Amino acid sequence: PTIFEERHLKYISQLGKGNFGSVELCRYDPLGDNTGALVAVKQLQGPDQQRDFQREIQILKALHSDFIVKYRGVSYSLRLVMEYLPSGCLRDFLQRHRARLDASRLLLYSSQICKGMEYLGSRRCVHRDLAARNILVESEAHVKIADFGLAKLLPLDKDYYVVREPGQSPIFWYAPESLSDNIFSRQSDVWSFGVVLYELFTYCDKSCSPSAEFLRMMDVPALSRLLELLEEGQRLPAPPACPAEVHELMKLCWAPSPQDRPSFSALGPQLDMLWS
Numbered sequence: 001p002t003i004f005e006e007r008h009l010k011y012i013s014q015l016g017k018g019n020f021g022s023v024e025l026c027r028y029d030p031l032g033d034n035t036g037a038l039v040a041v042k043q044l045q046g047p048d049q050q051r052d053f054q055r056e057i058q059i060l061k062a063l064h065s066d067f068i069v070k071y072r073g074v075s076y077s078l079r080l081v082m083e084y085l086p087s088g089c090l091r092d093f094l095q096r097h098r099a100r101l102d103a104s105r106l107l108l109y110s111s112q113i114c115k116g117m118e119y120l121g122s123r124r125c126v127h128r129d130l131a132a133r134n135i136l137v138e139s140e141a142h143v144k145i146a147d148f149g150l151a152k153l154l155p156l157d158k159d160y161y162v163v164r165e166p167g168q169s170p171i172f173w174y175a176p177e178s179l180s181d182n183i184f185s186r187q188s189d190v191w192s193f194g195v196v197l198y199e200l201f202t203y204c205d206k207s208c209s210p211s212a213e214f215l216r217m218m219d220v221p222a223l224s225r226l227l228e229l230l231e232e233g234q235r236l237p238a239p240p241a242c243p244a245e246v247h248e249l250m251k252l253c254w255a256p257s258p259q260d261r262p263s264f265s266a267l268g269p270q271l272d273m274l275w276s
Ligand SMILES: *C(=N)N[C@H]1CCc2ccc(-c3ncnc4[nH]cc(-c5ccccc5)c34)cc21
Pocket: 015, 016, 017, 023, 040, 042, 069, 082, 083, 084, 085, 086, 088, 089, 090, 091, 092, 133, 134, 136, 146, 147, 148
């Protein structure tokens, strides 16, 4: 079942557009009667790009967690086939359901994302793009981490990596060491996780989003302006009505030095205690 024939993948619509890729909603319909299952299909639109896409497929196929989007297979590598979660990403879900979801529910999502991240860390996988737009909703009480387009495996003898060119992602989720020196690690994923906790507790309201709020708080360019703000110790403010303990955890995720941030394994029990 891990080999999907191209002729049987029926295009429905666009789910997203990446760096040099796209994700489409397709129906895998071998019977041709519209009764087949819906799937999310990623494809490249370059020899390095092809190598990186094959790397992504190999990473996702080797991840088995209730908190990581499921790999289904490949089509010939021409396309990466994943499960489709019709509730879509957490960012939009929170905006739609804000008046229904309480602090307990946000802590449950936080705990699930943390468990997914502890698991990725155990596989020596740096995600590099953790954000509420990349977290999917399986059900009202179950979320999963998605978007492995920038994920990288750490070699056995090195706990970080350096990128030659600065990143192309919206800058507001990057750890200071990534902004300054293009260094990524499981500890920079912890920094981004703190921003995801911020997103959850603001219900992804656009008016106090990481972009809107950092830009408001901010000749010198935006990247350098953000790095200056962060280096001064300025941070995103506690979301409206945020539990104090939750804001304290965000601040720990945003410790200036990566070695001072808590690990996902240390955050996990703290989030579970707050949820209980
Ligand atoms: C929120 N609006 N999230 C969007 C932004 C981009 C994008 C792409 C794909 C999905 C998506 N939705 C449902 N089911 C999915 N299964 C896998 C993916 C996926 C694949 C690659 C990167 C991210 C997400 C799914 C949602 C959104």
